[PDB]
Amino acid sequence: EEGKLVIWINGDKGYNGLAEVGKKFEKDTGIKVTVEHPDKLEEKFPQVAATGDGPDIIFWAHDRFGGYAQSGLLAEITPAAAFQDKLYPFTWDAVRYNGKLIAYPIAVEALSLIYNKDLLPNPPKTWEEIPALDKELKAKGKSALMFNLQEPYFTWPLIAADGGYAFKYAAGKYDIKDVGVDNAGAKAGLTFLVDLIKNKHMNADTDYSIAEHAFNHGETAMTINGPWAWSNIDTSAVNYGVTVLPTFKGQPSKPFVGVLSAGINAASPNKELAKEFLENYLLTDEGLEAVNKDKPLGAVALKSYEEELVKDPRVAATMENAQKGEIMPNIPQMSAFWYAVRTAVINAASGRQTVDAALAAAQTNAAADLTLVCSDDKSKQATLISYPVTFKGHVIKDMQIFCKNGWMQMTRGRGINMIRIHYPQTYTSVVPGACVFRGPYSVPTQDSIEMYTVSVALLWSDGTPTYESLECYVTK
């Protein structure tokens, strides 16, 4: 709707403060500003913006914006040099996609270790110490650590500590072909997490609100969270510190660093109003103050403000953790990475898959966009799903699936491609066209399980071949 600004931002952010900024905007321009916090908005935005609908402005960490830009959902930003100089350059670099500025950077985000000083004056420096510490607190009616296990954002710092990575950065770009989900380091880290759960130091079902409640009411000595979380702790009775994440196998935990960013919907008729709102209301000492006061932003992108923020030790700790991590890629393939790791962590933590199997499925999903939906019952068939998210640059051109009975080609277009995979011995005769698992194979680790597998050959646009396999496991 023209003559009005609609803003979407995550419900864990400073939306009331931004609303107050919006009030400051309406009052001067007569233009009403409505701030909303849709659920799973990072998914809902590309859905509705694609229909020409949605907000004028969308706020999210920069990693999602490359996908948005590739789908044509974001207007190009062209700020003056003067405005550009007001913000730190690396924050601008975070919002650049295939050459163009696709958003306004706002603040730099990283997870930190947050601890209750009255329970735990000297918090552990290593993950390895948490079990012994938990045993001591449990006797006192408390627990050592609770944090959100449902979102891979929070568990990634540990998985990445021993060598896990999303995409390798080489020769001036992310190498979409070199995916780090499945390696020895990632396995060691996720195994440590799963072991914390097996040993009842953490609970697989723990989510954001459970961990927030447990920490802010004094039940658990530590939590892992970002700056947005500090204001609720300020309200609580907890005297807290914000410090460096614990090390794992002697290496720093490596949080993925986000830059909170504001994109303008390409379909918005209101773009000039959105630009002026963002530049002359939101990014100002006053506006950033308003939002930061409602819920802290971390290290803001605005130079004038940063100088006052660097004095807040919580922000300093934030930047200390950021320096030990890595800025998130913004490439479209990140959406497949995050989906794949979310599934792996949830499945490993619950005990539905082993760490090795979970990561192996995650690796293939993040790298090749292939998901295999297994059935516990052999008589019900598996489904292989191909769902490409990257349409530009180095991409898989050709895909061949190796099934027990031969090779079959599978195309990559924008859309979704699904085939059934049959377990062998299931059909009384050979079914024309059907892809059949190789197996059953033994699994040395677990004696009660049978493995089935198919293989895949990938031909990249540059001629590079690569190979994947996908497994399903079944109880005998």
Ligand X SMILES: OC[C@H]1O[C@H](O[C@H]2[C@H](O)[C@@H](O)[C@@H](O)O[C@@H]2CO)[C@H](O)[C@@H](O)[C@@H]1O
Question: Which residues contact ligand X by CB under 6 A?
Answer: 10, 12, 42, 61, 63-64, 109, 151-153, 258, 338
First-to-final CA distance of the chain: 59
Which residue matches tokens 């939101």?
Answer: 282
Residue among 94 and 436 whose Cβ is closer to ligand X? 94
Alpha-carbon span 287 to 17, nearest angstrom: 8
**Around 55, how many Cα atoms within 13 Å sit in the side-chain half-sphere?**
24
In this structure, what token pair is assigned to residue 392?
Answer: 């530009």
Residue among 346 and 368 whose Cβ is closer to ligand X? 346
Residue among 358 and 472 whose Cβ is closer to ligand X? 358
Containing 145, the helix (H) or strand (E) segment is strand 143-145
* Kind of pairing between the strands at 382-386 and 370-373: antiparallel
Which residue type sits at 385?
Answer: I
Binning the chain into helix, strand and coil, the percentages to the nearest 5 are 35, 30, 35
Residue among 20 and 42 whose Cβ is closer to ligand X? 42
User: Residue 435 CB, nearest distance to ligand X (Å)?
Assistant: 31
Residue among 189 and 258 whose Cβ is closer to ligand X? 258
In this structure, what token pair is assigned to residue 71?
Answer: 């789908």
Spatial neighbors of 141 by CB under 8 A, at least 6 apart, are none
Residue among 59 and 452 whose Cβ is closer to ligand X? 59
DSSP 256-319: EEEEEEEEEBTT-TTHHHHHHHIIIIISSHHHHHHHHHHS--SEESBHHHHHHHTTSHHHHHHH
In this structure, what token pair is assigned to residue 218?
Answer: 């004094």
Alpha-carbon span 124 to 161, nearest angstrom: 16
User: Residue 12 CB, nearest distance to ligand X (Å)?
Assistant: 5
User: Residue 116 CB, nearest distance to ligand X (Å)?
Assistant: 22
User: Residue 325 CB, nearest distance to ligand X (Å)?
Assistant: 12
Residue among 54 and 440 whose Cβ is closer to ligand X? 54
User: Residue 68 CB, nearest distance to ligand X (Å)?
Assistant: 11
Which residue type sits at 454?
Answer: V
User: Residue 460 CB, nearest distance to ligand X (Å)?
Assistant: 25
Residue among 261 and 381 whose Cβ is closer to ligand X? 261
149 SS3 class:
coil
Residue among 56 and 109 whose Cβ is closer to ligand X? 109
User: Residue 109 CB, nearest distance to ligand X (Å)?
Assistant: 5
User: Residue 113 CB, nearest distance to ligand X (Å)?
Assistant: 16
Alpha-carbon span 368 to 464, nearest angstrom: 14
What are the phi and psi torsion angles at 389 (to 5°)?
-110, -10
Q: Considering only CA atoms, which of 156, 306, 125, 167 is closest in space to residue 226?
A: 156
User: Residue 337 CB, nearest distance to ligand X (Å)?
Assistant: 9
